[PDB]
Write a protein that binds this ligand. Structure first.
Ligand SMILES: CCCCCCCCCCCCCCCCCC(=O)OC[C@H](COP(=O)([O-])OCC(O)COP(=O)([O-])OC[C@@H](COC(=O)CCCCCCCCCCCCCCCCC)OC(=O)CCCCCCCCCCCCCCCCC)OC(=O)CCCCCCCCCCCCCCCCC
Ligand SMILES: CCCCCCCCCCCCCCCCCC(=O)OC[C@H](COP(=O)([O-])OCC(O)COP(=O)([O-])OC[C@@H](COC(=O)CCCCCCCCCCCCCCCCC)OC(=O)CCCCCCCCCCCCCCCCC)OC(=O)CCCCCCCCCCCCCCCCC
Ligand SMILES: CCCCCCCCCCCCCCCCCC(=O)OC[C@H](COP(=O)(O)OCCN)OC(=O)CCCCCCCCCCCCCCCCC
Ligand SMILES: CCCCCCCCCCCCCCCCCC(=O)OC[C@H](COP(=O)(O)OCCN)OC(=O)CCCCCCCCCCCCCCCCC
Ligand SMILES: CCCCCCCCCCCCCCCCCC(=O)OC[C@H](COP(=O)(O)OCCN)OC(=O)CCCCCCCCCCCCCCCCC
Ligand SMILES: CCCCCCCCCCCCCCCCCC(=O)OC[C@H](COP(=O)(O)OCCN)OC(=O)CCCCCCCCCCCCCCCCC
Ligand SMILES: CCCCCCCCCCCC(=O)OC[C@H](COP(=O)(O)OCC[N+](C)(C)C)OC(=O)CCCCCCCCCCC
Ligand SMILES: CCCCCCCCCCCC(=O)OC[C@H](COP(=O)(O)OCC[N+](C)(C)C)OC(=O)CCCCCCCCCCC
Ligand SMILES: CCCCCCCCCCCC(=O)OC[C@H](COP(=O)(O)OCC[N+](C)(C)C)OC(=O)CCCCCCCCCCC
Ligand SMILES: CCCCCCCCCCCC(=O)OC[C@H](COP(=O)(O)OCC[N+](C)(C)C)OC(=O)CCCCCCCCCCC
Ligand SMILES: CCCCCCCCCCC[C@H](O)CC(=O)SCCNC(=O)CCNC(=O)[C@H](O)C(C)(C)COP(=O)(O)O
Lengths: 155, 93, 78, 183, 149, 353, 105, 55, 80
């Protein structure tokens, strides 16, 4: 009984009935949280946190910052339910039946006596192996800092 | 854009004028206001303000004592009609 | 020159003092950050006068002896 | 590190639920033609205690097993099983020897490690007793390769990093031998 | 002139941390040690007359990827993730009780069930176009065609 | 039945550990409100609440029971969502941040090499929880202090985040236990005294406590953002505010004052020398000492939160934004490069053991 | 040449060894064409996805039905709950079916 | 250029919060003084013979 | 039922709503990358994901900066 499915069904409903910009912002948070939680379990815990620190902590509270400076103004129920029920029939984004319905395993090895976190490897590669990517990204962030001022600052 | 033409103002003007005590129900461009309809100061102001509520055009103090006929008001709306600015949501999406 | 703004290519010492009295948050911020590279470039002085570097950590798997297998190895058999 | 993998038990039962993880047993055994061997039956604390003593006694056999892997060219698990039993038998030798020669000092050490998060820095006193007893019965000396002799960490007289909580048995056994053996 | 009345609230706040620390330290240590006493409840809870002093086992922090393998190894040896056993030779059960997790490898539910996040040019090709599968089916079919020859 | 009882506790003991843990935090949080008025009382030659419970001990419970049992003001008949999301998100955000604080060696509900990120990530959610309070619920006083609020706890979240990372850079670990256990021979108050001031200044501004208290500017915005809130929505939000004051007080002790580590190891060993290590009585006393060591340190900042409130006037809002960006940020961005330079110069790049 | 398939600890992962033999085969000077390296590339994709191996499991599951074989007697016994890896199931001689401790290591 | 305290002297007072820390200490002095509070209704404040109260 | 472009109904009717949909769409590509990087046990893919989060962050700022200037333009009369 995967309770993750129910939450998305709710979000798949309020997205269709969203009326004002309050609803759309709440869609973003209600999309991030199923992303963050399903990543905290299952695949990668490091990036479940890296989402919260950057997505919610930087952009989403900047979404609601600007939205307060924008505006605040202002089929039925059977069609919305019918749309969801037909949309819910197929939910296999892939079509490799063998790859979906067969489970696998990996065999652990004791060679890596130097156990380290996944972030240490990323730092060990992003700062040495792919330093150019890091230095270009710094350059892009420099462009934005100069870019954001010129657009907004009237003088 | 300004979608009002001369006929559109004239056609809807009568209905407002048919809503107030008028000596004759025949009103066109040549019809006056004080003479034909027998309207005094306070009577005429209500009709003039009423056309401001439907045509959404404000009449200034200069024209106040200089209004004598109903054709002038109909022609005035065209020269002074604009659509209210629409917010960023209505315009582009 | 009662309170004139110092010229940076004429009075370098007095130009520093202007930004040390009137903009304290800028002058002393850079100075703390300046010690970073300054101490980094002073490392070759430490490698000869204070102590020598440690040996690198054995973070490359099991150290494999640089030789060939020993055929004569026996014992602990079946 | 603690990242979810597909090879060992993950963080929580919810992780197992999302992945529909099945923990599968195999009821077979090794085929008859592969000779049998008795696996080492020690847990984490005994091994971490005896990791260096296993190295001294089995140094020639650890290297051959790892050298066999390199010379197998990716076919290690099938081409180094005979070498794999040599390492297991030598490792069992040390655990048995520590059990019949230095049994008291051995348990005092790894029980200290279980008490202090398996960190080698928290059980120096229970380790100095074990090293002296092993050197007088098995000739095995702990050594950390790469550095000088007088810079090995376990010989530091005033280590900067000491345990927060002192093991009582380690202190009692140290003081019991403080005056008796080390007059 | 130390006002003792103002110090009354801080004493309870001092006891606030103590209750959490006192219970958590003693309960977690007590349980961990109890589960290492044996592979069964009949020996976990029965204090032995012939046993020595009880040696405890404080909880482990800052674990790494080896400790996960160690815990499973101790589980297959002494029926607990932190069992204690320094026998030279493991039991006969240890030979053939290895546990190997088999799991699926499907994409997160939010990826394939959001009304918006599941729509992209390449995701529609995966979901509604057979061009990817027709090619990758031939490799699977060749496995059985290339046996008898 | 004793066989179905002894194993029953074996099936419920860890739930009780959390409940014991939950009550442990709430008791400190509940009596911080009482301790605030008392501490702020004598400092002002007042007396503080001493006539609600014996010597005023039952003062927080009176306010909790009073507020929880008031009429709840609602925009419509079934419009509870709007006046609950703001307080609930803020409460859960700071309640989940307690899953990482270690009461001793490995005495934390969550132990992972990403404790710092999880602690900082949960802080961001509470920031987003607060801006919901002043949103769309008419516009009289809550929406005035929501662009003001958001522009404050956004900016200082930069300075607070940098300070945390600079400490984590020194130990090369993001695990709070490693950070605590690595301060054995030194407390980061000695080398990083500027950071402790910067951390506490940012700790105050994030929680919106005075002097950086223009969120609920009492003389300017009546009750600030809580002027609409009443009864239970007020309790949840008010409880959210003080849990941060406890948490930020505890975090300061964890990072700069060594966490649960004893003040003196000589005294610490003498006390633990009296209890036999084979009886569980040793481990009850051990937890009390280590937690009490953390509590005394965390007490001083909880005292400091009230102390600064009783001696410093409020800071004008525009100078708050010009403060962190012009002053605190360049300093915190300079020690983030001063620290690696020194560590590498003497060949002391940290590792995780 | 840039690294690919780096495991979580900084070294080669499971499928890097099969990736290197493709690169060595392609860039070698002795090969007139890339025909020799066709099987080496098929193994690398096999390592990452196991699609051919999963297909062989689909047939075995499908074929076991048509003969009336039951998965209870051919399949590999498994335990689905991590708290029920009991010492009796683990094969310990004295072990008993009580739940094992997985609350906190 | 006409300030008595050198640039470093002014910066140390500025960066290290010299007056705020002094302000904190003086407040802490009052923490160890006897509060003026009396306990109504168990005690009353002073009254004068000229007090104007109930007719 | 995606070939009927159903997602367009789920988008809001403001410019700020379009911005949200794009970020959701870009977030879908990161979750797929983390899915691919973890299963392969590859840290090169997790570097890509870190870059996608960082780059998509900048794009959010530039979009709102343009929108804020655009919205200020309508209410830019400033007569008093
Ligand atoms: C060094 C001082 C200097 O040469 O310029 C003084 C320059 C003069 O400014 P000013 O005296 O106030 O203006 C008077 C004239 O109007 C200034 O107008 P100006 O036309 O006379 O000068 C502007 C300047 C153009 O400005 C720059 O080129 C600065 C380049 C960045 C440094 O052009 C030059 O002066 C050419 C010579 C300087 C070249 C610097 C090359 C540095 C290597 C890169 O001041 C600065 O630019 C300060 C730059 C340093 C900021 C702090 C950077 C810290 C980074 C490290 C921290 C971490 C460790
Ligand atoms: C230091 C040791 C003092 C001491 O412990 O005995 C005195 C103290 C009693 O003070 P006292 O008998 O009124 O002193 C004689 C005159 O009345 C004292 O009245 P006085 O006006 O003649 O003398 C006042 C004296 C203040 O008296 C002191 O010297 C106290 C110093 C404490 C400083 C702590 C920091 O001088 C000051 O005012 C210094 C104020 C400036 C200090 C600024 C802080 C810098 C750090 O004994 C106590 O500690 C009992 C109160 C606390 C009991 C602990 C349990 C409370 C309930 C917990 C719940 C269960
Ligand atoms: C802690 C959980 C608290 C949940 C409070 C709200 C519960 C209602 C269910 C919302 C969650 C479903 C996911 C969709 C996101 C919300 C979009 C939405 O339309 O919310 C509608 C909400 C209820 O109002 P309603 O009458 O149902 O709709 C018409 C309103 N004129 O009216 C609103 O606009 C919401 C007003 C409050 C907004 C607060 C921020 C949004 C919630 C963020 C935390 C919840 C995280 C998502 C949890 C569900 C995940 C699927
Ligand atoms: C500018 C100064 C450049 C000169 C320099 O410091 O680099 C040379 C130094 C190697 O010199 P050496 O001491 O002979 O090598 C010892 C190896 N055991 O190499 C070094 O290791 C010194 C490292 C200092 C340079 C890094 C900091 C530069 C400033 C940051 C911007
Ligand atoms: C419970 C089931 C739930 C299923 C969810 C989806 C329900 C169906 C929704 C509509 C489906 C239409 C598209 C069908 C899938 C896309 C086409 C495709 O992939 O091929 C399938 C079908 C037949 O393909 P087939 O010949 O069998 O291939 C076997 C090769 N070995 O290909 C076809 O022949 C389909 C006919 C398409 C040709 C006419 C339509 C195209 C012209 C109008 C397009 C609309 C405007 C687009 C303009 C493009 C913009 C530039
Ligand atoms: C947490 C880690 C700890 C972080 C904090 C570390 C604490 C130590 C801080 C070290 C860096 C601070 C630098 C302070 C030393 C230089 C200060 C100084 O000399 O003042 C600036 C000086 C101004 O000259 P002035 O004193 O005003 O002379 C006229 C008096 N009427 O200007 C000058 O002329 C000389 C400037 C020298 C520039 C190089 C420095
Ligand atoms: C040690 C000791 O004897 O401490 C006595 C303890 C703790 O005192 P407290 O009231 O929490 O101190 C508050 C901390 N301040 C005074 C530093 C602010 O008292 C009880 O546990 C009762
Ligand atoms: C924890 C213990 C705290 C005792 C405080 C106390 O006894 O509180 C006193 C209470 C509350 O009324 P009050 O106005 O504070 O009474 C004191 C008046 N003073 C403040 C002016 C001195 O009154 C009573 O004694 C009546 C009921 C018995 C105590 C009920 C306390 C709550 C239950 C605790 C046990 C389950
Ligand atoms: C040796 C060490 C000390 C050197 C002192 C030099 C002072 C330079 C100065 O003050 O530069 C002055 C200039 C120009 O000032 P203005 O306001 O444009 O004009 C001045 C006033 N007038 C109009 C009267 C002339 O400002 C700058 O570029 C400020 C640079 C700010 C950097 C902030 C980030 C720092 C981060 C630290 C590392 C992470
Ligand atoms: C290398 C050294 C590292 C030092 C690290 C610490 C730096 C801290 C900030 C220093 C700069 C500063 O506080 O500045 C003061 C700023 C900005 O003042 P301004 O706009 O420049 O006006 C002054 C103009 N002058 C130069 C002409 C004088 O406003 C304030 O009053 C902020 C008040 C903060 C109060 C916080 C109380 C918290 C108490 C914590 C313990 C109980
Ligand atoms: C929502 C709350 C609403 C609350 C509403 C509140 C209504 C406020 C009532 C204002 C009363 C005010 O004091 C008196 C006044 O209006 S001043 C008119 C006095 N007049 C003269 O002193 C001589 C000049 N007289 C004329 O010019 C004509 O009599 C006339 C004005 C009719 C023109 O019309 P024409 O000639 O037909």
């Amino acid at each position: 009984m995967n309770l993750e499915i129910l939450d998305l069904s709710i979000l798949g409903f309020y997205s269709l009935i969203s009326s004002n910009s309050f609803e759309s912002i709440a869609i973003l948070v209600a999309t991030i949280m199923p992303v963050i939680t399903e990543l905290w379990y299952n695949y990668s815990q490091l990036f479940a946190l890296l989402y919260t620190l950057i997505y919610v902590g930087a952009v989403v509270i900047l979404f609601v910052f600007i939205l307060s400076v924008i505006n605040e103004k202002e089929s039925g129920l059977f069609i919305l339910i019918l749309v969801l029920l037909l949309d819910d029939l197929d939910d296999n984004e892939s079509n490799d039946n063998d790859y979906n319905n067969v489970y696998i395993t990996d065999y652990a090895d004791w060679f890596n006596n130097y156990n380290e976190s996944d972030l240490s490897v990323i730092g060990n590669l992003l700062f040495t192996e792919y330093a150019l990517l890091l230095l270009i990204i710094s350059f892009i962030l420099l462009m934005s800092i100069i870019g954001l001022i010129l657009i907004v600052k009237k003088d | 854009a300004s979608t009002l033409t001369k006929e559109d103002v004239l056609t809807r003007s009568v209905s407002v004028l048919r809503g107030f005590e008028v000596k004759t129900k025949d009103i066109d461009l040549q019809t006056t206001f004080v003479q034909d309809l027998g309207m005094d100061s306070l009577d005429l102001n209500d009709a003039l303000v009423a056309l401001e509520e439907e045509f959404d055009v404000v009449f200034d103090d200069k024209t106040a004592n200089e209004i004598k006929t109903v054709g002038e008001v109909v022609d005035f709306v065209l020269a002074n009609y604009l659509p209210t600015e629409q917010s960023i949501n209505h315009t582009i999406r | 020159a009662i309170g004139d703004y110092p010229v940076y290519y004429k009075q370098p010492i007095r130009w520093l003092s202007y930004h040390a009295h009137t903009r304290p948050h800028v002058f002393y911020a850079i100075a703390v950050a300046a010690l970073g590279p300054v101490f980094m470039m002073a490392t070759p002085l430490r490698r000869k006068f204070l102590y020598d570097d440690h040996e690198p950590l054995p973070a490359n798997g099991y150290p494999l002896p640089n030789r060939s297998r020993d055929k004569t190895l026996t014992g602990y058999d079946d | 590190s603690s990242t979810h993998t597909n090879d060992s038990l993950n963080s929580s039962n919810y992780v197992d639920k999302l992945k529909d993880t099945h923990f599968v047993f195999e009821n077979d055994k090794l085929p008859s033609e592969i000779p049998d061997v008795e696996e080492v039956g020690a847990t984490t604390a005994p091994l971490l205690s005896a990791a260096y003593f296993i190295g001294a006694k089995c140094q020639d056999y650890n290297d051959d097993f790892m050298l066999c892997q390199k010379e197998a060219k990716g076919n290690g698990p099938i081409d180094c099983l005979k070498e794999g039993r040599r390492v297991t038998r030598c490792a069992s030798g040390v655990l048995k020897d520590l059990n019949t020669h230095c049994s008291d000092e051995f348990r005092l050490h790894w029980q200290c490690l279980s008490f202090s998060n398996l960190e080698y820095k928290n059980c120096r006193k229970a380790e100095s007793l074990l090293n002296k007893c092993v050197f007088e019965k098995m000739n095995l000396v702990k050594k950390i390769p790469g550095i000088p002799e007088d810079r090995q960490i376990h010989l530091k007289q005033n280590p900067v990093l000491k345990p927060v909580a002192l093991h009582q048995d380690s202190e009692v056994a140290f003081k019991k031998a403080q005056n008796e053996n080390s007059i | 002139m130390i006002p003792f009345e103002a110090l009354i609230p801080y004493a309870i706040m001092f006891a606030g941390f103590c209750l959490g620390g006192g219970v958590m330290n003693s309960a977690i240590t007590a349980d961990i040690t109890k589960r290492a006493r044996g592979p069964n409840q009949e020996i976990k809870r029965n204090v032995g007359e012939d046993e020595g002093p009880r040696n405890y086992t404080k909880p482990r922090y800052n674990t790494d990827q080896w400790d996960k393998y160690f815990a499973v190894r101790d589980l297959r040896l002494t029926g607990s993730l932190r069992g204690q056993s320094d026998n030279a030779v493991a039991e006969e059960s240890f030979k053939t009780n290895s546990i190997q997790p088999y799991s699926n490898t499907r994409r997160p539910w939010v990826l394939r069930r959001h009304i918006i996040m599941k729509n992209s040019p390449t995701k529609w090709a995966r979901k509604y176009s057979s061009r990817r599968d027709e090619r990758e089916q031939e490799i699977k079919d060749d496995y059985i065609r290339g046996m008898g020859e | 039945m004793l066989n179905n009882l002894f194993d029953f506790i074996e099936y419920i003991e860890y739930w009780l550990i959390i409940v014991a843990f939950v009550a442990s935090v709430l008791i400190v949080v509940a009596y911080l409100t009482v301790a605030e008025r008392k501490t702020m009382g004598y400092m002002q030659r007042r007396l503080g609440p001493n006539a609600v419970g014996y010597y005023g001990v039952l003062m927080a419970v009176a306010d909790a029971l009073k507020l929880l049992s008031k009429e709840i003001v609602l925009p419509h008949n079934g419009d509870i969502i709007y006046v609950m999301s703001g307080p609930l998100i803020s409460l859960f955000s700071v309640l989940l941040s307690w899953a990482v604080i270690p009461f001793g060696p490995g005495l934390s509900l969550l132990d992972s090499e990403y404790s710092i990120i999880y602690l900082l990530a949960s802080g961001s959610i509470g920031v987003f929880g607060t801006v919901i309070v002043g949103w769309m619920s008419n516009s009289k006083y809550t929406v005035l202090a929501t662009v003001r609020t958001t522009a404050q706890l956004i900016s200082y979240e930069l300075v607070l985040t940098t300070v945390v990372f600079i400490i984590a850079l020194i130990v090369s670990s993001l695990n709070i236990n490693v950070i605590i256990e690595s301060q054995y021979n030194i407390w980061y108050i000695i080398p990083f005294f500027p950071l402790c001031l910067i951390f506490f200044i940012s700790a105050l501004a994030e929680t919106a406590r005075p002097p950086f208290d223009n969120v609920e500017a009492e003389s300017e915005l009546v009750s600030g953002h809580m002027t609409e809130l009443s009864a239970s929505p007020f309790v949840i939000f008010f409880l959210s505010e003080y849990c941060s004051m406890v948490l930020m007080s505890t975090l300061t002790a964890i990072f700069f004052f060594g966490g649960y580590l004893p003040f003196s190891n000589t005294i610490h060993h003498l006390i633990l020398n009296l209890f036999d290590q084979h009886s569980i009585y040793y481990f009850i006393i051990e937890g009390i000492l280590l937690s009490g060591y953390l509590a005394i340190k965390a007490n001083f900042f909880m005292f400091s939160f009230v102390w600064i409130r009783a001696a410093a006037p409020r800071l004008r809002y525009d100078l708050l934004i010009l403060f962190c960006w012009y002053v605190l940020l360049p300093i915190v961005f300079a020690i983030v490069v001063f620290a690696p330079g020194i560590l590498y110069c003497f060949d002391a790049l940290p590792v995780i053991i | 040449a840039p690294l690919q398939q780096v495991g979580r600890h900084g070294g080669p992962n499971k499928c890097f060894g099969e990736f290197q033999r493709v690169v060595e085969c392609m860039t070698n000077a002795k090969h007139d064409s890339y025909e020799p390296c066709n099987n080496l590339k098929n193994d690398y994709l096999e390592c990452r996805k196991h699609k051919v191996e999963r297909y062989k499991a689909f047939l075995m599951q499908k074929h076991a039905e048509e003969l009336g074989k039951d998965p209870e007697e051919i399949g590999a016994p498994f335990v689905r709950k991590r708290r029920f890896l009991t010492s009796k199931t683990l094969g310990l001689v004295d072990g008993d079916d009580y739940e094992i401790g997985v609350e906190k290591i | 250029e006409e300030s008595s305290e050198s640039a470093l002297s002014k910066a140390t007072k500025w960066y290290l919060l010299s007056e705020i820390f002094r302000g904190l200490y003086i407040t802490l002095e009052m923490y160890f003084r006897a509060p003026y509070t009396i306990y109504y209704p168990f005690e009353k404040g002073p009254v004068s013979p000229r007090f104007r109260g109930e007719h | 039922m995606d070939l009927i472009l159903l997602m367009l109904v789920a988008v809001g009717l403001n410019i700020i709503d379009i911005y949200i949909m794009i970020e959701i769409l870009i977030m879908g590509c990161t979750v797929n990358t983390i899915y691919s990087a973890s299963l392969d046990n590859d840290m090169i893919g997790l570097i890509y994901s870190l870059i996608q989060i960082i780059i998509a962050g900048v794009e959010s700022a530039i979009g709102l900066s343009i929108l804020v200037n655009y919205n200020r333009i309508r209410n830019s009369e400033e007569i008093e």
